[PDB]
Design a protein around this ligand. Structure first.
Ligand SMILES: CCCCn1c(C(=O)c2cc(C)cc(C#N)c2)c(C(C)C)c(=O)[nH]c1=O
Lengths: 403, 553
């Protein structure tokens, strides 16, 4: 087969990201795997004249070790190719479906040779314990998994493969993103599942050996309590919340509410509700359950996601492009391991984000950089990696999104 | 020799070309020295002479070795190096002795003339051309180019290392029982055979090295244990840092104290409870290395304690893959932490130290967790697995903190160990308002040009108090106002502020800070019985906030 030549962004150079230290068990797994990919000719050993590097890890998908390459740098340095030059259009109908199923079609790429002059940029390194030997270095000879260039390049082979299946069920939406296919229908759940098995067989003739329910995605509104007795404290909290909300949702009002908090009163003190505040309250509740008037998705901007830890296994999140113009808010819940849950939450959020916008968000993560870096691998099950940075949640933000 | 291993292809950075530096004319003895060297190199294949066209040149120089009468060939590749491609890093991270399996028998053997034993990419040789000038330069000089890896060129240490590795590969495949560590041009080799089958496998290893152009020490020039290396003293079944003298001095200079801290920090790898906080406070301030620094009382206390731990020699043991690792941590005092890692108590694989602070305000529970994380990453690197931990904190003290703190956190398998000082939470903020406790509505304020500050409060019991502060920032007044409310309040108090900033600091339950204020606030919070802290939107006319806001201006 003939290879599509690939060009970096002019000026800027390949990736030189250093390999994180790995536990012996994962090294063992990576060796086995890579020894086998090398026999099969997908990768080849490389000399010191290759300066570039990309991190690699082992995840568990199922109890077989899988190999995961972190191409975030590459992808960023490659962006022009897989987004502007080629690049899959994203269907608005995908999010509208009753059921969406995600299939791994990464094995497809291993059958297509990678542009010979691009290979050096796919370099990765298996480390050794205590630096006893030098790492083992490889680059890729075929479309690698996790590189946004691979689906970009395999795109036309993918259209060919899916065309019969698309012709026969023209109300099913199929969306490709990185190593995955996203398949959406409105069929009853059993017919949907049957239609996915049919698809697998199409995939199967070409070497490609869980369900979402997006309709039932709805806002996690900033929720206002329904107290029996109110205290100054509770009203103060109410005002703070509405005070937050009002910077996001046009129409929020707090005046009739403050009138109650008049003078210098003890926090623990009960005060009955003004007839007007009682209307204000309900009127604000109307506004929160609805989408934000004035906020729209700009396809040219990065997505961001903030996650707050609520305790008791609950996690709140928002997605936006410009701070606190929220495109979506939600929650996730339930191994009382903080990092495990957090890892789970990021993948759910990332997945929804792909279904909705065909884009992955940069995460603001409420955890110590080093802690997350040491552990996220142990629970990661996706084939991509979002961009993340680390943040100290503003104490106020957390309570305002409680439930 | 020159190894028969294929060459590494090489290039220069893309928009560039080989150097064209001109030769700085040289004295006659230098010219003579150079010629006597290049003739010799040329006879061994190391270099070849060329007649232009070759347009490239890199200057050469000759120097007199030590005090003796050897001349040496210095080449300045400064310019070619700039024009040469980047190579993948030679080898990042160096083994730590604590990570070595103990070995029945070890042999050290070093490659001779290591760089000159490896070929250079033919297509690249022409950029290494240099010229020995003629006397006073009046005639065309003698031009050579390199065939092998030049001392001083940018690619040499990398291409060498990769060569040694391709060469060693086949023998590693056939001899998995045998361990070879590559460091620079040295080779360290160990197995668990007896002096018989070992020396045998060694000579076999040399002969392999020899087919491949790499000469090595014979059984008679092979150095003997103890080995010294990267600042350690490796023995057959223990290891330690190389001996350390804390010098006797009446007066210390900046330079003297830095070297002492470095020697200390290095020593703390295996010597338990080394401290350097008090010696380090001394370095603070912009001083000249020549300057004498009087030791404070605590710094001389520190040097003392340190001097004592160093008195008897301590050593480390090697790693046994079949056993678990344990790490113990102890609070060694003010933001200082010390840890040990052993497999059978208390014979340490290694030890270490953790001083860092993370931000301006933290408590012990955070700090301990940060050390745990630091120790954890270090184990992954050295032994390829996380240690079993032993911490001076009750599972309940740690449980209370984790669940109520906003950040996600987590440490691997651990258990409690009663090694005081234990880490505890020194106060807890109430989770609801307190009934029948005075409510202080506090506030602070500052004029951006003036730098003058007011800080005060109002209470639901009618008290009011405001004070002035000179040269202060808008956020310093907001803490002051909270200190204020804590000073004049009883054992139980509610406090309302509009400062997210103050709220943030206090709600995180600090118990030490870079701020005297925050230390002051802390000392109060510990003296209290219940304190409940809450936040209100500024300038919405809310409750008592309006009043105390009006009073400060
Ligand atoms: C008698 C010392 C045994 C230490 N050792 C070694 C080893 O000898 C060694 C190790 C390093 C990292 C550097 C240097 C130097 N200079 C030597 C080895 C080597 C064969 C790797 C070993 O496996 N086990 C040891 O205990």
């Amino acid at each position: 087969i003939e290879t599509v030549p690939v060009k970096l962004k002019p000026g800027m150079d390949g990736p030189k990201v250093k390999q994180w230290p790995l536990t012996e068990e994962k090294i063992k797994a990576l060796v086995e795997i890579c020894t086998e990919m090398e026999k099969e000719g997908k990768i080849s050993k490389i000399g010191p004249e290759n300066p570039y590097n990309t991190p690699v890890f082992a995840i568990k998908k199922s109890t077989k070790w899988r190999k995961l390459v972190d191409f975030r740098e590459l992808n960023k340095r490659t962006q022009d190719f897989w987004e502007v030059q080629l690049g899959i259009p994203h269907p608005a109908g995908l999010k509208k479906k009753k059921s969406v199923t995600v299939l791994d079609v990464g094995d497809a790429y291993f059958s297509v040779p990678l542009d010979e002059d691009f290979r050096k940029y796919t370099a990765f390194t298996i480390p050794s314990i205590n630096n006893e030997t030098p790492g083992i270095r490889y680059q890729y000879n075929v479309l690698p998994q996790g590189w946004k260039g691979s689906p970009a390049i395999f795109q036309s082979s993918m259209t060919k493969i899916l065309e019969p299946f698309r012709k026969q069920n023209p109300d099913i939406v199929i969306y490709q993103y990185m190593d995955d296919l996203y398949v959406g229908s409105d069929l009853e759940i059993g017919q949907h599942r049957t239609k996915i098995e049919e698809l697998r067989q199409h995939l199967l003739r070409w070497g490609l050996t869980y369900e979402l329910h997006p309709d039932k995605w709805t806002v996690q509104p900033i929720v206002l309590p329904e107290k029996d007795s109110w205290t100054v404290n509770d009203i103060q909290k109410l005002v703070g919340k509405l005070n937050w909300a009002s910077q996001i949702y046009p129409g929020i009002k707090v005046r009739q509410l403050c009138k109650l908090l008049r003078g210098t009163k003890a926090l623990t003190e009960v005060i009955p509700l003004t007839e007007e505040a009682e209307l204000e309250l309900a009127e604000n509740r109307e506004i929160l359950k609805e989408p934000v008037h004035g906020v729209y998705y700009d396809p040219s901007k990065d997505l961001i996601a903030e996650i707050q830890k609520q305790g008791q296994g609950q996690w709140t999140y928002q997605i936006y492009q410009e701070p606190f113009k929220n495109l979506k808010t939600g929650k996730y819940a339930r191994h009382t391991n903080d990092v495990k849950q957090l890892t789970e939450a990021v993948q759910k959020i990332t997945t929804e984000s792909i279904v909705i916008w065909g884009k992955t968000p940069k995460f603001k993560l409420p955890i110590q950089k080093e802690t997350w870096e040491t552990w996220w691998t142990e629970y990661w099950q996706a084939t991509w990696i979002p961009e993340w940075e680390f943040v100290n949640t503003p104490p106020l933000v957390k309570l305002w999104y409680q439930l």
